[PDB]
């Protein structure tokens, strides 16, 4: 069940001196990479792409080539309350916040798209701060009109 959401090769790791520190994800024909993550995307064609920064929203976006547009995530403008699927495990959406079990998400666990029960991306998580048992997440989502609202908990901890 949960293993049927990790067969997504469209995500790409970021290499820094041979180590992993973040993930760059392609959604809706555009490649999003977290700004604070330093490194180079393993894929050469995506690495060669020139990206335009966005300091306020803390991620840089680039336009993928035409031949790569076909195999790409699909975003969703509706975020129903309750269960969601992630690579590390289950996530739950309540009152506008994503929460995960403690210790989920750490060094190099940012830029991972959060998948829905249908199997399409709804948001991209950039960091998380621990709150008791359930760690809250700083995550950028997409509104119904397409304004890409960001929800960030207070004193957010990077990655």
């Amino acid at each position: 069940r949960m293993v049927m959401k990790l067969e997504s090769d469209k995500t790409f790791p970021i290499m820094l001196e041979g180590k992993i520190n973040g993930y760059a994800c392609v959604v809706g024909g555009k490649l999003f990479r977290p700004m604070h993550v330093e490194g180079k995307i393993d894929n050469d064609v995506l690495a060669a792409l020139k990206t335009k920064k966005a300091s306020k929203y803390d991620l840089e976006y680039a336009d993928v080539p035409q031949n790569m547009r076909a195999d790409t995530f699909k975003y969703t403008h509706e975020k129903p309350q309750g269960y969601y699927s992630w690579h590390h495990g289950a996530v739950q959406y309540e009152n506008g916040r994503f929460t995960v079990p403690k210790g989920v998400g750490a060094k190099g666990d940012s830029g991972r798209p959060i998948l829905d029960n249908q199997g399409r991306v709804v948001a991209i998580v950039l960091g998380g701060v621990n709150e008791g048992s359930r760690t809250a997440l700083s995550v950028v989502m997409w509104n119904e009109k397409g304004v890409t609202v960001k929800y960030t908990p207070e004193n957010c901890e990077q990655w």
């Binding site: 509104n143 009109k145 304004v147 609202v149 960001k150």
Partner: protein
């Protein structure tokens, strides 16, 4: 007579000085208003 500091400034000089000093303030006010409007719009459109 006696010479005042602004005695010899003509009307044309005054208009030029007001355009240079007084029009730049208008441009600054316009920019500040635009920035405030944009910030309020984007902040209200987040939620």
């Amino acid at each position: 007579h006696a010479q005042t500091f602004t005695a010899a400034v003509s009307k044309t000089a005054w208009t030029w000085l007001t355009s240079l000093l007084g029009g730049s303030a208008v441009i600054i006010i316009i920019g500040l208003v635009l920035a405030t409007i944009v910030a309020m719009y984007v902040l209200t459109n987040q939620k």
